[PDB]
């Protein structure tokens, strides 16, 4: 079973209020390096692993890079390079008794590979995972950390280079990414000649560092963070170590 969000957020937030404007885990030792999935539909493994890596960095100040390949090979609830679910991934991490660091189990993508849970002496596990309600993404980011989220990607998304992306959404939820924070940029309109506050979510994508902004993409949101473009965060899970 998963955990109750309201019971967990009471524990990590308390009564403490926060700034809805800008916050980014990359600046507070909460975001591990950007990785790549070449010719493989294993985003589900990159998105969930990365969230675990983040929790070790946040809760234990332990930078550990874990094996997506072990998840691709050994996650039996999911279909490696054919697609999977973030929650099933977390269920299988618990069942497997954790994952080997990617130093002991490297990523070989679509290349055929067999599952071997004994590639290392010490595995890195999780206690459980939590489902984040679509209206509490900004609060969950701020007090719990980076979230494994689903998103609907369009071909325009693959052509993203910099700034904030909007209005080019996929037909269905096809990709798994990590929500690493939120921000705001005040921009004076060239027409009205008046200043406007432009809020955005900061997302970590597993398409290498050559993609977008150092492997990251900023997506338009509002001050509240209720605005979820391309169904971002429809599926929102955060592991707890
Ligand atoms: O795994 C993918 C490829 C992503 C990708 C990699 C490099 C790129 C790119 C997209 O655009 C430019 O360079 C990918 C993602 C979503 C859907 C499908 N699919 O055809 O079923 C493949």
């Amino acid at each position: 079973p998963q955990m109750n969000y309201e019971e967990v957020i009471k524990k990590y937030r308390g009564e403490e209020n926060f700034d809805h404007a800008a916050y980014d885990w990359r600046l507070h030792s909460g975001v591990t390096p950007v990785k790549d999935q070449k010719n493989c539909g294993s985003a589900w493994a990159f998105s969930s692993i990365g969230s675990v890596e983040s929790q070790y960095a946040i809760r234990k100040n332990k930078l550990i890079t874990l094996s997506e390949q072990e998840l691709v090979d050994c996650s039996f609830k999911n279909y490696g390079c054919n697609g999977g679910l973030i929650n099933n991934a977390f269920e299988d991490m618990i069942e497997l008794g954790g994952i080997c660091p990617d130093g002991d189990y490297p990523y070989v993508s679509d290349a055929p590979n067999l599952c071997n849970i004994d590639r290392c002496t010490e595995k890195y596990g999780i206690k459980n995972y939590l489902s984040v309600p679509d209206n509490k993404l900004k609060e969950a980011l701020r007090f719990l950390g980076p979230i494994s989220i689903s998103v609907a990607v369009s071909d325009d998304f693959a052509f993203y280079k910099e700034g904030i992306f909007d209005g080019e959404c996929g037909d269905q939820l096809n990709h798994a990414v990590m929500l690493v924070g939120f921000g705001m940029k005040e921009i004076v309109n060239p027409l009205t000649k008046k200043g406007e506050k432009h809020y955005y979510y900061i997302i970590k994508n597993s398409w290498g560092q050559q993609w977008g902004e150092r492997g990251f993409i900023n997506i338009e949101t509002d001050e509240s963070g209720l605005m979820r473009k391309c169904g971002l965060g429809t599926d929102a899970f955060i592991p707890l170590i």
Side-chain angles (χ1 to χ4, degrees):
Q2 326 177 358
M3 294 150 99
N4 186 276
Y5 178 77
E6 305 310 322
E7 291 307 306
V8 179
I9 205 72
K10 276 179 192 180
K11 173 77 178 278
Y12 288 86
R13 165 177 186 156
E15 295 85 357
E16 177 76 13
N17 204 341
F18 76 103
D19 186 25
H20 281 76
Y23 192 74
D24 194 345
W25 278 107
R26 302 181 295 211
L27 307 168
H28 304 283
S29 184
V31 182
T32 52
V34 171
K35 300 185 191 180
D36 203 317
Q37 65 186 110
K38 189 178 180 180
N39 299 316
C40 178
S42 49
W44 58 269
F46 281 91
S47 176
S48 52
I49 289 287
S51 283
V52 174
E53 291 181 2
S54 282
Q55 288 299 306
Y56 277 114
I58 290 160
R59 308 296 166 187
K60 301 293 173 187
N61 193 30
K62 171 63 174 173
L63 172 65
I64 194 63
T65 53
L66 303 162
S67 181
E68 280 85 5
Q69 196 64 53
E70 192 173 352
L71 219 57
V72 159
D73 296 343
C74 307
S75 190
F76 182 76
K77 289 194 180 81
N78 298 301
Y79 307 130
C81 282
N82 287 3
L85 296 176
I86 295 151
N87 60 323
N88 295 155
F90 289 138
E91 283 289 341
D92 283 354
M93 283 176 197
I94 299 156
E95 289 309 314
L96 287 163
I99 300 297
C100 285
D102 55 11
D104 295 306
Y105 210 136
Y107 186 72
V108 296
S109 68
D110 55 357
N113 198 20
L114 294 179
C115 166
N116 190 341
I117 61 154
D118 186 26
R119 284 210 207 172
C120 61
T121 61
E122 204 190 290
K123 308 197 93 192
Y124 290 77
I126 61 150
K127 290 183 152 184
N128 207 356
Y129 69 98
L130 171 71
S131 180
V132 179
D134 58 3
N135 65 327
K136 298 293 181 207
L137 299 173
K138 282 204 168 176
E139 179 192 54
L141 263 170
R142 174 60 187 97
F143 296 101
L144 285 156
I147 299 167
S148 285
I149 54 152
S150 63
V151 65
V153 303
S154 173
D155 58 275
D156 303 297
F157 179 93
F159 283 75
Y160 168 83
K161 284 141 204 181
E162 48 180 15
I164 293 155
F165 176 100
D166 182 38
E168 310 109 326
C169 296
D171 282 17
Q172 69 198 68
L173 300 156
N174 50 20
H175 200 270
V177 292
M178 280 188 60
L179 197 58
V180 298
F182 44 94
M184 76 168 277
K185 194 183 176 170
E186 200 195 343
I187 305 155
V188 171
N189 185 346
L191 306 163
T192 73
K193 299 166 162 175
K194 287 191 201 168
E196 291 163 6
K197 292 185 182 177
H198 301 262
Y199 298 88
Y200 54 92
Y201 272 124
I202 307 155
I203 284 169
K204 183 181 157 187
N205 193 14
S206 43
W207 289 3
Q209 276 171 25
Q210 302 99 309
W211 185 82
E213 290 187 357
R214 192 181 206 190
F216 299 79
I217 184 160
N218 307 116
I219 306 297
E220 187 181 19
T221 195
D222 47 4
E223 188 184 14
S224 62
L226 302 166
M227 188 196 269
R228 305 179 299 109
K229 294 290 179 191
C230 303
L232 59 88
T234 298
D235 309 292
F237 302 89
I238 178 154
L240 286 164
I241 64 163

